[PDB]
Design a protein around this nucleic acid. Sequence first.
RNA 1: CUUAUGACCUGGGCUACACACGUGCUACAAUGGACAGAACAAAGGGCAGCGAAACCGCGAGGUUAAGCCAAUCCCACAAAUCUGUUCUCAGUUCGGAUCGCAGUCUGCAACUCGACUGCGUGAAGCUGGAAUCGCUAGUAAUCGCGGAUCAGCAUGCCGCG
RNA 2: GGUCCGGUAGUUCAGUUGGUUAGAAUGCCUGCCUGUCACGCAGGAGGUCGCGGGUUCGAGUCCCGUCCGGACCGCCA
RNA 3: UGGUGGCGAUAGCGAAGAGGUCACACCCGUUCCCAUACCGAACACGGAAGUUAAGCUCUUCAGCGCCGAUGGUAGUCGGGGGUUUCCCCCUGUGAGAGUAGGACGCCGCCAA
RNA 4: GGGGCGGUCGCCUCCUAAAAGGUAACGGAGGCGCCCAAAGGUUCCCUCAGAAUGGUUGGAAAUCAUUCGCAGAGUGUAAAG
Lengths: 108, 120, 63, 176
Amino acid sequence: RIAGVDIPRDKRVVISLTYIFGIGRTTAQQVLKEAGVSEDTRVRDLTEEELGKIRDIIDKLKVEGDLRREVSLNIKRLIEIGSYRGIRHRRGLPVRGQNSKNNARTRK
Amino acid sequence: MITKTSKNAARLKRHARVRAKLSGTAERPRLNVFRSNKHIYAQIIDDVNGVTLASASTLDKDLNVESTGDTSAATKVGELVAKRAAEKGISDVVFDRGGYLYHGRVKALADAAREAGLKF
Amino acid sequence: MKAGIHPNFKKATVKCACGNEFETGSVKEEVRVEICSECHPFYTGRQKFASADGRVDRFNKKY
Amino acid sequence: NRLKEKYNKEIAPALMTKFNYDSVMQVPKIEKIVINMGVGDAVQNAKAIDSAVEELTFIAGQKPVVTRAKKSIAGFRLREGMPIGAKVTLRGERMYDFLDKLISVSLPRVRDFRGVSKKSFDGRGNYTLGIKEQLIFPEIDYDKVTKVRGMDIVIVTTANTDEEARELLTQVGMPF
RNA sequence: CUUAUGACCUGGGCUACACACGUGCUACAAUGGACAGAACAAAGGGCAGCGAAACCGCGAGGUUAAGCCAAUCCCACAAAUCUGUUCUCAGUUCGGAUCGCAGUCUGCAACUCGACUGCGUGAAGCUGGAAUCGCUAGUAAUCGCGGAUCAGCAUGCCGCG
RNA sequence: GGUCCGGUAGUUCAGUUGGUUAGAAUGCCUGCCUGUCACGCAGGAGGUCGCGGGUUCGAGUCCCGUCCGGACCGCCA
RNA sequence: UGGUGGCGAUAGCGAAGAGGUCACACCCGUUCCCAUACCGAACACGGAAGUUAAGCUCUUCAGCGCCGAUGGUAGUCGGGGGUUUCCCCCUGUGAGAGUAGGACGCCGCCAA
RNA sequence: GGGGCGGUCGCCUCCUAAAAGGUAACGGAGGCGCCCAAAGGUUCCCUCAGAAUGGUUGGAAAUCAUUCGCAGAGUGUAAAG
């Protein structure tokens, strides 16, 4: 729809474009202000040109179809590059130096 | 290129299939048709001697019609081969469609022969 | 066509967002297209005009 | 229709000069596009195929055919006789209509797209494609779809070798 | 023992990880969350230190720098609270875990092995079995704020309202 | 030597019939209680069916054969 | 050259090469009979734009497949022996997988 | 192949069976005491099993597409034809 992904239609547009992969709340709000399309709209009943002038700005920033693969390529680069950080990523152990005695059930 | 069978080659199996059940002897000869995409032929065959009694076609040298491939020509060639049966009269003939389906120009030939008077 | 068991088929034009045309049939009557084959960058030959792309391995601490 | 006009006018002449065919009707021609649904049924819910049938009759222009399983295999708990998968063949103006929709709207609307696979060939000039999403043309009512099983696409040509089909499908419009 | 259980030096380890126990912190939400506005404390610290205002930087912070050996100056804009707008009961504008990217400070040095910022991603978790604990009023429960230790590092401790 | 029985979690028995689900006590592990241990209270895994072969979409459970045990009989001179 | 037949594929499967004005067939488009458990490739429907590409017909070849007696044997009827769970002699009879080669068609009947 | 004990007693299929039919044994192998309102009757139309290659859920095989493929597959059920 917007960039591949659909949008929950009955909500505010600022909350709704964060469901796409690549922009959070703060980054969404400033591109939405540059878009100039109100920023307090229900996306169910906006019009087509204010729908469409954000396409060009999300084209020149970057989203899932590119961020997913570049973070994948960078992380497998870190994998086979031979780093301690890469081998920790491989083995599922924590990476940011946290202790493995008592925690990190988020991984493994 | 995908193997598309020849329509005539597929037709031979159905014609042999129907010919296994029936054949045209003396004083009970076999009707025979051809349904080429441009012309319709009719033939009368005696099997015990391998000879033909009478025959007709759309490309006969007379009664040519701009149809020459339609049901009007089918009726005309049917009653043509009906009088061809009549002069050396058999007055009886068994039916044998040539691996076709009894609905179209073959049917036109059939009731052409019927009302012209070759008893089936 | 066994009638009734097939849905209705009719002429149904295409409006891309870029405004490109296409003489198309569909079961519906009208389709809004967000991105066409003349503007989606892979079918723009090879990234003709839709790109924000590039990748380097840069090792620069000179500031 | 438009594709038929372009194929008659320019596609077939260009390739017949390119392969130097003596008879101009030795030209390769796309024969049938068949769309085959497959459900991992195995007696889980009857309504999966009973939804995919009328989804595919909206994707194409006519009703599909519920395929019949050949033999039972208990490796899926598949009893022979209960229905699995759907199929529909497309030909005539219909095939060019569907390929039109494909090239025009469908592949650009995939969530992520790189070039179509280089060597999905049979070895004898046929091609097979696998897509993961039902979102082919945008006027499917996308809110009604529940399951996410995409489609299987089989184009059959009169190509005897892979190279002629490979070259002709380029000017058909398949990216590579 | 002085031809090492004594010294010197570099690097590593004291921070590991299939699991278990304890003590704490934070959540599972609308007596809420986000955004704007309005306030109202005590108690301490500051000279190889506190470092104002102003300017730059989205922000961590950076720059020139006022004053203060302090009931003058600085740390230092307290928060909870109240008023209004919005969200409309969902794994969510809850929750932020873990990760990728780009940075800030300190320090010879931030990889094992620091903290912080802007990003993007967004985890489990929708009140917790058998059990079991603290607490007789400014207490409990919640709300922030100081200090020590100190190049940098606090959810811990001590104390303050 | 013949005939008939059974061969299942570590142990003991169901399921072995229902061809189309592998279960129950006990044991073991973890947590709770107790000063500690034992009782007692919460949680959890396990076997993939004596073996081999054959039928069927599909065998623990159908049919043969091999092995292990048990019961019965092995008589008339 | 087309239609239809009989002969054990000695008829085939292969590999190559030619043909189409006529005939045959690919083709054209489903409108009305009729149809596609979905569809004019399929059934039919009614034409004739170009096409020997395929189908089909002829030309060549022993690669495969097929047919194939001659003299040899194995076996065996009947006699006759022997050291006899099996061997031997004679009058006959005649194995097949092996080659000599044959064959990559023979005869009609109706429409050119 | 003394009786007892064991096993068997009717019907169907193959081998034993000596190239017609038949042919015994406590000889060698299996099945049957049904099922099918169509798994019949006619009419009409097709054609397998397996393998190779592509295709996602999806594979060792679910469903498609192509090619090879005399019969390996089916033929309600035992074997034979």
